[PDB]
Paper text:
Several natural systems exhibit ‘facilitated dissociation’, in which an effector (E) can bind to a target–host (TH) complex to form an excited ternary complex ([name])20–26 from which [name] target dissociates quickly. We set out to design protein systems that undergo facilitated dissociation. We use a switchable target binder (host) and a flexible effector that can rapidly bind to and switch [name] target–host complex to induce a large steric clash with [name] target, forming a strained excited ternary complex. We show here that by explicitly considering excited intermediate states when designing coupled protein systems, a broad range of facilitated dissociation systems can be designed.
Residue numbers in the entry:
A (entry chain A): 3 to 255
B (entry chain C): 2 to 18, 26 to 122
C (entry chain B): 3 to 25
Amino acid sequence: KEEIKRLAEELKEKTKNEEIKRLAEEAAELAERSDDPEVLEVVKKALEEALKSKNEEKIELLLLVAVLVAEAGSVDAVEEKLEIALLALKLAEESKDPRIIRGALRAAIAALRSDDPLALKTVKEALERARASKDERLIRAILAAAYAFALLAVAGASAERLKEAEAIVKELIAAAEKGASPQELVLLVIEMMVKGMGVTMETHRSGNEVKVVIKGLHESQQEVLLEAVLFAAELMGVRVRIRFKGDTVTIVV
Amino acid sequence: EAVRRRFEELLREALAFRETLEHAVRLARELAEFAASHPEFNRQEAVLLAIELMVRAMGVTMETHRSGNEVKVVIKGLNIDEQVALYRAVRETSKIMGVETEIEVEGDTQTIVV
Amino acid sequence: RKKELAKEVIETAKKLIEKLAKE
């Protein structure tokens, strides 16, 4: 257990990437809370492999494994939270796209930080849909919708606002099947946040730039929209420009 | 005058280094709270120091290029969490100091125009 | 009936961490 903290410390002494430092300590803090030796070895093992690779992208994927296990590895775990970490480790192993591996791992980690049965149900059903597909654009979008849907339930959205977001998830999954562009799919991620936050929305189109201006957002809300869009565009491969001005958020595609 | 020494003291605190990521926001809030207690200092310049307190702590790159009467800052190498943290410090220190700030986020780069 | 999946989660990571070092 104490050795786990050492490997994480011996990692930041040679690394600088904020994720590598952070995930090293998050996996160590979540270790003590779950004193089941199975967890105390997977984290330790994932740390020793992270000490043996200059590939930082590989390091993060190895540390997200330890954090995902130790979050549900705590005895205070329901069935859904355990089922999400399973599909997220399966769906990540089968794919060779580092985006999908990082996406499915970070989507579950943010999802397992919420005891909300509706959010855990939607994610699990979303993972079971991406695990049952092959079109990687559908998977890179399903993981983006689930991670953004979890960030709303973790932030403390209303039970009515969440159901207005779960419908967008259905819209986001079905529209990608027909073959929606990466940009029209990210625009659905933007709508899920807006509708999930109960704020205004104005859609304008200039050439091939779909400017989206959102108002009435608080800083606690402008950070959830920022962290989600930066995650969705990371998977979908879309150059987005997000502008702020106090109480206004302007997203351009 | 006293703000310049306060920046160095908080910079040595920051250069020593999201729980170790939010501490940089608390350090940036302190300089803005002291630059607000010392109104003699330039409000635009005080916010530029807060972004530097975060960048010099996070170890990312900071590029400065003006465009007229307004200053533009371009920080690169940031990830998703760091840009959420940098957005918070810039926004908070803006309210504390009272300057208008427009922020641009694209890729691993956060453009802030003060 | 739930911890049945908790073992598979660990084993799904065991191979995911190990077999990636078959090189």
